[PDB]
Amino acid sequence: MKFTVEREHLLKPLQQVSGPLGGRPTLPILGNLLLQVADGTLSLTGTDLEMEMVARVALVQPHEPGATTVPARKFFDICRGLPEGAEIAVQLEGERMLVRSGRSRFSLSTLPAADFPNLDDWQSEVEFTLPQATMKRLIEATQFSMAHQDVRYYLNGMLFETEGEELRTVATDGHRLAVCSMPIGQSLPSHSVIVPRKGVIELMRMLDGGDNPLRVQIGSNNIRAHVGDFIFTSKLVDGRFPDYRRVLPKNPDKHLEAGCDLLKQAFARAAILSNEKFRGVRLYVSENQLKITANNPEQEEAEEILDVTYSGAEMEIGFNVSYVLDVLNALKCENVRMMLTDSVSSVQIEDAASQSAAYVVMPMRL
Amino acid sequence: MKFTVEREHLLKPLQQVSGPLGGRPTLPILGNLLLQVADGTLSLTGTDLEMEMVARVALVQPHEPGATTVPARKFFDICRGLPEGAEIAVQLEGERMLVRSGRSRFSLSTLPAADFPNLDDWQSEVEFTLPQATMKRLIEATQFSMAHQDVRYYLNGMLFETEGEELRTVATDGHRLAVCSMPIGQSLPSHSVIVPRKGVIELMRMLDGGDNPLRVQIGSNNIRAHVGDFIFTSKLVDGRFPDYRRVLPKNPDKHLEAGCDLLKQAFARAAILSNEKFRGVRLYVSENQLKITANNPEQEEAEEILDVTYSGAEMEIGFNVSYVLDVLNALKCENVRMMLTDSVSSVQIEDAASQSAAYVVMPMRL
């Protein structure tokens, strides 16, 4: 296996396939990349057994076919360290891979390609394409609400649902929920899968802004996402997600609208003097006014009063200010709508200007 | 106690005094600031019993005398959270401090001023002033070479030494050393003191980088620095600090000149394949040439060759590559000079264009 490639043509591909990886996987080879020259193409693959990322680079310089497995972080670090515009020449030599550029030379340890974990083939059942920025919006709107290492293992990832011509994400912790829905211009079967949170993370990071469409293929136990020269595959979480329809408030009749930043800043100051563990804050709503109060066990007390747009019945509600601040921080918009019912019902929060994303936070008795 | 002060006049002083205090020390009053209104000045003090920072802010608005202590981090976070141009009105109300600004109101717990640790008075035995820039240069040249937590406690700080008309710092961990001297235009007494690491950090932090001069007072067991409205006091460390004159190589006649950035990037690449614990590389010096090699327990190897200016005898010498990098990262210059003796002696490294700072690194047997 020989190839000579310009540094910059390797950097983005290396960075993408090092995503699954780690620097003691225990299983050593998981800390290696797989390099394959076949045809006029270098392919690079990294995996953690659950998911796999593969990148392809066109070889316009002379090459020879073959395959090996090298330490991913060492190889990336060498390529990154070499100067802007460097030509990088790579050669298999015995049990070692040689890397030369200018006056610099490296020989890395290898592990047999034949030994590199392969994900089983599987058949695609549902497919669609959509713009990258659309998938990226969908994930970023909701990712912060996934659980991390909950016993309820199906919460530790993100639901991707297709319905009508819409693709929707849903993430919940069991405490707060996020849902985002975008039209993507293709009639879709009605279908749900759960992508593991590590996979959501890798998917999110393969999306580079650009003009390359994302093609998605879903099978019974896998998902694959292909954009330009990058192909991501993951196992799905074999589990039953909650239904977000059962979580949204029922026709809330009390709408408050405020400046997102003014609201965020008020909650952020009040939060200083909230209970460190439970983070309860109280809202008092009244005609075009919101009062926020926080206390803590030391009986310190904050209070914020700000002008808002509200014409509903006066009411109080409590909730967790960290959850509310996470939503406000996700939204990044001019104005926010809080859809309220009473002191004993969840709140739904949205960009005043778009119903695409919606967030549900549960009431606290304070 | 009452005062009203514009956010932007309170923020910097608060950040300075509150910085190094925790959110929740065992001994709670050390987590508080002492606030004192007296004679048309607000004084803010923080301490950890070794060192103390005091800021003074002239009160140009109506105020009333008195003193209390409040949680440092919380008071800062409330003031920082308030909008630009906020006027902050504070008043002691029983045993709570009320902070009010716009329609935001906070009530903080207090501890009695009379319980706030008072550092003993002491006498100044040496005094000088210098430009803030000069102290910045002195500390930044050397701080990286201080030990972090050596059982030789005096190595964990920084020697400040007056000789003639110069101020000098020196830092060392017994393996590598930094020393930097600058002229300060006063005839000084020959004196040395050691400042603990935490004190060096604060000294650096207090340097806003305007041209308020710094005024330093040194006593038998303390140091004080005074810039603008800030006053920083620390205890000094006991023990016999090494004498850099003895660490500097006696006569490092072999002189090498190289581009600083080239040389850095070559060591940084080589280091990837050096032993993760011991970090050894080997330099081969020859006529106008430097070759750097590395290898690790995996038998992986790097080699860099670069052009340099050298006319001495050929020599081979091993180093801990992290030590060399640290020095090249600290030299923010075009060309570096290295000054060698032999394979078992230390190397001296300096800016080819300035002799103000010198760095000495002890060799490895590899």
Side-chain angles (χ1 to χ4, degrees):
Chain A
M1 183 195 70
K2 309 193 171 17
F3 64 85
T4 296
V5 290
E6 169 174 329
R7 166 173 178 273
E8 283 78 37
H9 296 174
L10 233 54
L11 247 36
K12 239 210 139 298
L14 277 175
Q15 192 224 303
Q16 212 52 257
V17 299
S18 296
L21 278 81
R24 188 170 146 238
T26 51
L27 211 84
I29 198 179
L30 271 50
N32 283 21
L33 303 181
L34 176 74
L35 282 42
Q36 299 156 135
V37 181
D39 187 65
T41 297
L42 214 215
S43 305
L44 306 98
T45 298
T47 186
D48 73 350
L49 265 26
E50 297 291 280
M51 48 189 241
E52 168 183 87
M53 178 73 77
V54 174
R56 274 72 143 85
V57 327
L59 301 179
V60 56
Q61 296 180 64
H63 39 291
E64 304 176 1
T68 192
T69 261
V70 284
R73 187 201 291 96
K74 282 175 215 180
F75 187 47
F76 176 57
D77 282 351
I78 291 164
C79 292
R80 194 171 21 102
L82 287 165
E84 199 183 314
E87 210 60 33
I88 305 182
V90 171
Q91 242 183 258
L92 227 49
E93 297 195 10
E95 221 84 320
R96 294 214 114 60
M97 180 177 205
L98 276 56
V99 186
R100 304 163 222 58
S101 180
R103 15 30 156 182
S104 308
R105 156 185 93 50
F106 307 83
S107 56
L108 300 168
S109 57
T110 67
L111 247 24
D115 285 46
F116 197 74
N118 217 55
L119 261 32
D120 288 326
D121 288 354
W122 50 276
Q123 328 283 140
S124 177
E125 250 32 112
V126 181
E127 311 188 339
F128 49 94
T129 66
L130 80 172
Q132 280 183 64
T134 294
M135 176 65 92
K136 186 178 217 52
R137 198 285 173 93
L138 253 14
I139 303 171
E140 283 172 351
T142 61
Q143 146 166 216
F144 73 85
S145 291
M146 301 185 290
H148 300 298
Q149 284 189 18
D150 195 289
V151 192
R152 289 122 84 194
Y153 61 95
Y154 45 88
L155 300 182
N156 305 324
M158 186 182 283
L159 190 77
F160 289 62
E161 189 179 3
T162 61
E163 200 194 5
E165 300 173 30
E166 278 208 327
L167 176 59
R168 163 157 62 256
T169 52
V170 186
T172 179
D173 239 351
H175 307 294
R176 30 89 97 86
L177 178 139
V179 179
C180 193
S181 304
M182 305 283 275
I184 64 164
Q186 317 172 36
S187 163
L188 268 4
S190 289
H191 202 259
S192 307
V193 290
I194 302 172
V195 178
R197 62 168 291 107
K198 196 161 165 212
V200 174
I201 281 6
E202 261 349 277
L203 178 49
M204 182 48 157
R205 279 167 184 167
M206 88 178 324
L207 286 30
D208 65 26
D211 281 334
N212 292 152
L214 176 56
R215 178 178 111 294
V216 178
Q217 295 175 296
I218 294 178
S220 63
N221 301 91
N222 298 93
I223 184 169
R224 167 160 312 171
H226 189 290
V227 51
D229 294 316
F230 307 81
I231 306 183
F232 177 61
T233 308
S234 187
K235 289 174 157 147
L236 275 4
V237 180
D238 191 9
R240 57 206 49 223
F241 209 75
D243 181 8
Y244 77 90
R245 303 162 189 81
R246 237 17 240 221
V247 172
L248 300 306
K250 331 172 278 185
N251 145 83
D253 67 319
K254 295 171 192 58
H255 310 113
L256 170 162
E257 249 188 82
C260 183
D261 194 72
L262 273 165
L263 184 66
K264 177 200 302 206
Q265 292 329 301
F267 278 123
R269 288 183 302 264
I272 297 163
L273 302 184
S274 77
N275 185 296
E276 294 189 348
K277 187 137 189 258
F278 299 100
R279 296 268 105 180
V281 293
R282 294 205 55 82
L283 271 68
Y284 299 82
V285 292
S286 63
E287 193 80 8
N288 286 176
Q289 192 204 257
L290 169 68
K291 186 198 251 173
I292 302 149
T293 69
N295 19 272
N296 62 28
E298 302 110 287
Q299 311 250 292
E300 301 177 311
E301 291 181 316
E303 179 186 284
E304 294 282 347
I305 291 118
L306 65 168
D307 306 327
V308 296
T309 296
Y310 184 74
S311 65
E314 285 180 6
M315 74 161 272
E316 317 166 33
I317 187 159
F319 43 51
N320 184 301
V321 73
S322 292
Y323 296 161
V324 174
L325 284 169
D326 291 333
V327 169
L328 298 178
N329 282 323
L331 277 181
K332 336 146 283 245
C333 56
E334 297 159 286
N335 298 297
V336 159
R337 178 172 287 101
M338 293 189 85
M339 300 149 75
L340 266 358
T341 297
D342 49 42
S343 68
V344 70
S345 305
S346 302
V347 190
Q348 183 167 330
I349 306 167
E350 289 180 19
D351 182 351
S354 170
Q355 295 166 63
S356 302
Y359 301 86
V360 176
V361 168
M362 288 186 200
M364 291 173 69
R365 175 79 157 178
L366 286 40
Chain B
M1 192 199 73
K2 161 172 171 307
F3 65 80
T4 304
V5 171
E6 207 278 303
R7 178 172 177 268
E8 286 73 59
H9 283 158
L10 201 62
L11 222 31
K12 182 187 219 343
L14 219 49
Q15 191 171 280
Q16 279 292 332
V17 294
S18 68
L21 271 12
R24 202 74 73 175
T26 16
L27 190 238
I29 203 161
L30 270 28
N32 280 18
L33 301 177
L34 165 66
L35 284 48
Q36 285 171 130
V37 178
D39 260 28
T41 290
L42 174 61
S43 302
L44 302 94
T45 308
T47 189
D48 65 4
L49 269 36
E50 254 259 288
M51 63 185 237
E52 171 182 79
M53 182 80 179
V54 185
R56 301 213 130 72
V57 338
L59 264 13
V60 296
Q61 320 183 33
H63 48 287
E64 139 189 332
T68 191
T69 83
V70 292
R73 175 96 50 73
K74 289 178 182 171
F75 180 47
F76 179 63
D77 285 355
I78 287 169
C79 290
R80 187 197 33 180
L82 275 176
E84 190 166 320
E87 293 289 346
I88 305 179
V90 172
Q91 136 197 346
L92 180 60
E93 191 193 282
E95 77 224 326
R96 314 296 214 155
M97 181 166 261
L98 270 45
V99 182
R100 284 180 180 103
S101 182
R103 259 119 126 253
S104 316
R105 304 187 51 277
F106 308 77
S107 188
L108 295 169
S109 57
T110 69
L111 270 354
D115 288 338
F116 194 81
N118 193 336
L119 245 72
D120 282 324
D121 300 339
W122 51 278
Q123 312 287 343
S124 164
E125 305 292 3
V126 179
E127 302 180 354
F128 46 92
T129 67
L130 65 176
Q132 279 198 78
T134 297
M135 186 65 83
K136 168 153 122 64
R137 169 92 249 267
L138 253 358
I139 298 179
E140 292 194 309
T142 56
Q143 165 176 203
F144 81 94
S145 300
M146 298 183 299
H148 310 267
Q149 293 185 294
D150 203 290
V151 300
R152 292 118 84 212
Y153 53 96
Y154 52 86
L155 291 185
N156 298 322
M158 177 182 287
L159 193 83
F160 281 76
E161 176 175 31
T162 60
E163 217 193 330
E165 287 197 39
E166 291 205 307
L167 218 209
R168 173 153 58 253
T169 46
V170 357
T172 184
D173 66 359
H175 301 290
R176 39 87 173 267
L177 178 143
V179 50
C180 178
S181 318
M182 303 283 285
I184 63 175
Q186 298 141 88
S187 296
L188 277 11
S190 291
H191 196 69
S192 297
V193 303
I194 317 167
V195 181
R197 148 173 303 288
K198 281 168 150 83
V200 173
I201 292 315
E202 284 315 313
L203 276 176
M204 192 62 161
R205 242 157 231 190
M206 83 191 298
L207 267 23
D208 66 47
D211 45 53
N212 292 144
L214 184 68
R215 205 184 71 261
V216 181
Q217 299 174 120
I218 294 167
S220 75
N221 308 93
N222 301 97
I223 183 161
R224 174 159 293 157
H226 193 288
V227 215
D229 298 321
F230 300 132
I231 296 181
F232 174 59
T233 310
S234 177
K235 307 233 249 207
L236 253 22
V237 180
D238 325 305
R240 318 198 274 99
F241 202 95
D243 172 349
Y244 76 93
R245 287 162 283 257
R246 241 98 245 287
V247 166
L248 256 26
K250 325 178 153 171
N251 184 264
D253 66 295
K254 298 172 175 77
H255 289 320
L256 182 142
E257 256 200 71
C260 190
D261 297 354
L262 221 35
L263 190 68
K264 176 162 41 172
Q265 275 182 22
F267 281 120
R269 287 191 302 261
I272 300 155
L273 298 185
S274 78
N275 183 291
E276 302 181 346
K277 178 160 191 81
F278 289 118
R279 296 268 102 202
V281 298
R282 304 185 70 173
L283 288 59
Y284 298 82
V285 63
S286 64
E287 183 170 57
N288 292 335
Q289 198 157 103
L290 169 62
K291 169 170 78 171
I292 302 169
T293 60
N295 55 79
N296 56 27
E298 287 69 53
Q299 309 170 76
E300 296 177 319
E301 312 188 271
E303 179 187 289
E304 298 279 341
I305 301 182
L306 51 159
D307 301 320
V308 303
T309 304
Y310 180 65
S311 274
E314 293 175 14
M315 217 195 112
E316 194 191 37
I317 187 166
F319 286 107
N320 174 326
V321 68
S322 293
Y323 291 164
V324 177
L325 265 352
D326 285 350
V327 163
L328 300 179
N329 276 336
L331 292 168
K332 57 188 188 71
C333 66
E334 204 162 302
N335 295 118
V336 60
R337 176 169 3 264
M338 311 183 236
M339 294 143 83
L340 296 144
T341 301
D342 58 30
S343 60
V344 304
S345 301
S346 299
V347 59
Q348 181 171 151
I349 310 181
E350 3 171 294
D351 179 347
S354 178
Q355 298 70 210
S356 297
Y359 305 88
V360 176
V361 176
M362 281 189 172
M364 225 166 269
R365 52 160 147 75
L366 225 348

